[PDB]
């Protein structure tokens, strides 16, 4: 179609599936096995890039160019990335992932939406959709391109470190914020086939159903460990919500390190081939985890031969090395060249990769866009998050008898009021694992607003604001205080660190919370990634707020604290009595909860 030196993959006219097959026709095996490499970039050059013919980088947790780094000198290290991937022979470009599962929370400035679980609470899919619509926007003015979100695990055991990943205990919720997915994406046409990957455009992020399947699952909470259920229960629990991923075109799923009655998910190919390929027809590509492969062994890492043929042969397209690169290709290279690997598998990952690119519209857009730097941490998408915030919090109490004066709404005149609490004035605790470092940090890690902060900006001026971290109780009764809003909870976690058997919360928190209540009547706002052991904190307390772990924006919860907006929040979790229960879920023989899934009490706005 047309000049001398036309070349049909480079022509964005046609169709996608006649590019992929033009372009993976001139592909030698060398540039095939590339496409299936996925690399962190601390281990990326432009000679790595162009010599392995690599299809694809990452970030994991707190992997930056540097700290505080801007949205341009991101921009400039993916496009650096890119320049060495277009320079190969075929010049296909790479395509660069990140967690961004709260936001772009990984950059500095970015705005911190609140965690799933939160999220959850809300039960407002359309909330989700617009914050998949800001996430997209932020990480596009980094020039990343591809999201590893939503996870859509349906945790079953909140003793499990990434219970916060999950919308909820109920299946249900957890389809409904499936809207995730075409916010980041964008919304697929009239016509679309279930199972086929989209991506809208250049401001829009291909994105990533994970962690296949039954993740939630697992003994004990017990991270990457055994889920055991029979198909009807993963049937039934555990993979609907891939089903209406697969409705809105989903580019991409991660595996799980978890397994299925005893079987690693990584060498799991009834269900990566047999179902979620042959069966929910998904024609995007199937991403290992982060050395996930490794992991199909025991001990992790002893055979790597065996990990990469049993997940090649299981099904899987693109591995996340993602640093021993040379090895990965080199003994994928041998099983092809020995025929234990055949090429029609090879071809089919690679087909579902460019598919993924082509479409996604990587080939015409291949660099960043430096005017869509400025869209990072805008005040549109703070206010989003703050609405967000708001929307999760659940009001667990509201006066110790029911008779006494509801304490919420708080007034915002009055003469002296307290703050208090480890996790009043830290943003870092606000926000929980997966921000700015892998498993999330303490104290100023990015901007944005603590809940003392939005104290002190919601007040009137005439109330004077005193903070203590830790106050004891005699402080609080000669203070004058008119009321105190008592901050406590989880510290930041991410993954097997947040496995916890006694869901306690960490001291000092329930004894400042017992000084600041004896002393003063108290609003108790609690932080944390799941329900956690609260009946010592509701004895002490007025009112006591589960906010989860909010984000960036602290006004959220101020918003209803003093009124603007009343509580309107639902548990999209049990709340458990005792760690003993556990597991327990709506539905089972024990069903015994201190707080059932769905409560939530209200206050109308002042
Ligand atoms: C589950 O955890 C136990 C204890 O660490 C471990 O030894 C076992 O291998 C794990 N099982 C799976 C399927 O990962
Ligand atoms: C509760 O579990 C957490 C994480 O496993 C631990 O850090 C804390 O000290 C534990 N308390 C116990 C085991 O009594
Ligand atoms: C909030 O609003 C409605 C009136 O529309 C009422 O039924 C509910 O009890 C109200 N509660 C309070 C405390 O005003
Ligand atoms: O899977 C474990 C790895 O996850 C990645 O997101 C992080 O960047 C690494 O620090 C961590 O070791
Ligand atoms: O950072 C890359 C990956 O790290 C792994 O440790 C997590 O399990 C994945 O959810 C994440 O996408």
């Keep these: ?239 609907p919500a891939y089903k209406n991923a697969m409705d809105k075109g989903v580019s991409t799923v991660m595996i799980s390190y978890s397994s299925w009655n005893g079987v690693k998910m990584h060498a799991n190919q009834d269900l990566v081939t047999g179902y979620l390929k042959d069966t929910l027809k998904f024609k995007g590509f199937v991403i290992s985890d982060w050395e996930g492969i490794d992991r199909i062994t025991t001990p992790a890492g002893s055979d790597y031969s065996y990990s990469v043929k049993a997940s090649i042969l299981a099904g899987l397209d693109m591995i996340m090395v993602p640093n021993k690169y040379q090895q990965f290709i080199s003994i994928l290279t041998g099983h092809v060249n020995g025929g234990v690997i055949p090429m029609s598998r090879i071809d089919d990952a690679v087909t579902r990769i460019l598919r993924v690119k082509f479409t996604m519209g990587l080939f015409e857009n291949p660099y960043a866009d430096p005017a869509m730097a400025e869209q990072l941490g805008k005040q549109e998408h703070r206010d989003l998050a703050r609405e967000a915030a708001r929307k999760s919090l659940v009001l667990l109490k509201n006066g110790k008898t029911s008779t006494d004066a509801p304490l919420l709404p708080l007034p915002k005149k009055a003469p002296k009021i307290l703050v208090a609490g480890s996790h009043a004035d830290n943003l870092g605790y606000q926000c929980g694992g997966w921000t700015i470092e892998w498993q999330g940090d303490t104290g100023r890690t990015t901007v944005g607003t603590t809940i003392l902060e939005a104290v002190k900006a919601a007040v009137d001026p005439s109330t004077v604001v005193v903070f203590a971290e830790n106050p004891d109780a005699e402080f609080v009764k000669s203070g004058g205080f008119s009321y105190a809003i008592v901050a406590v909870g989880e510290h930041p976690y991410t993954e097997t660190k947040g496995d916890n058997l006694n869901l306690t919360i960490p001291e000092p928190g329930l004894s400042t919370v017992q000084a600041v209540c004896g002393g003063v009547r108290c609003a108790t706002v609690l932080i944390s990634g799941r329900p956690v052991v609260v009946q010592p904190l509701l004895a002490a307390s007025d009112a006591l707020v589960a906010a989860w772990l909010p984000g960036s924006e602290g006004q959220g919860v101020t918003d209803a604290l003093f009124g603007d907006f009343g509580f309107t929040g639902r548990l999209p979790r049990t709340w458990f009595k005792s760690v003993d229960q556990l597991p327990m879920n709506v539905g089972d023989a024990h069903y015994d909860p201190l707080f059932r899934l769905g409560y939530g009490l209200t206050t109308n706005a002042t």
């Design 1 to 239: 179609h047309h000049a001398a030196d036309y070349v049909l993959y480079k022509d964005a006219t046609k169709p996608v599936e006649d590019r992929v097959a033009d372009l993976l026709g001139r592909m030698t095996l060398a540039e095939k096995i590339g496409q299936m490499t996925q690399i962190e970039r601390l281990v990326a050059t432009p000679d790595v890039l162009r010599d392995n013919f690599i299809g694809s980088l990452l970030s994991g947790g707190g992997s930056v160019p540097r700290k505080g780094a801007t949205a341009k000198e991101w921009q400039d290290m993916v496009d650096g990335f890119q320049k060495a991937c277009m320079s190969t022979r075929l010049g296909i470009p790479m395509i660069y992932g990140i967690d961004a599962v709260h936001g772009q929370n990984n950059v500095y400035g970015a705005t911190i939406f609140p965690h799933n679980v939160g999220l959850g609470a809300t039960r407002d899919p359309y909330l989700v959709k617009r914050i998949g619509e800001a996430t997209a926007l932020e990480v596009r003015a980094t020039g990343i391109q591809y999201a590893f979100a939503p996870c859509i695990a349906v945790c079953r055991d909140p003793r499990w470190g990434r219970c916060y990943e999950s919308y909820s205990e109920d299946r249900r919720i957890v389809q409904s914020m499936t809207e995730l997915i075409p916010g980041l994406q964008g919304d697929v046409p009239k016509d679309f086939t279930s199972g086929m990957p989209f991506v809208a455009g250049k401001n829009k992020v291909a994105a990533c159903a994970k962690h296949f399947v039954g993740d939630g699952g697992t003994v004990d909470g017990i991270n990457e460990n055994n889920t055991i259920i029979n198909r009807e229960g993963l049937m039934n629990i555990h993979m």
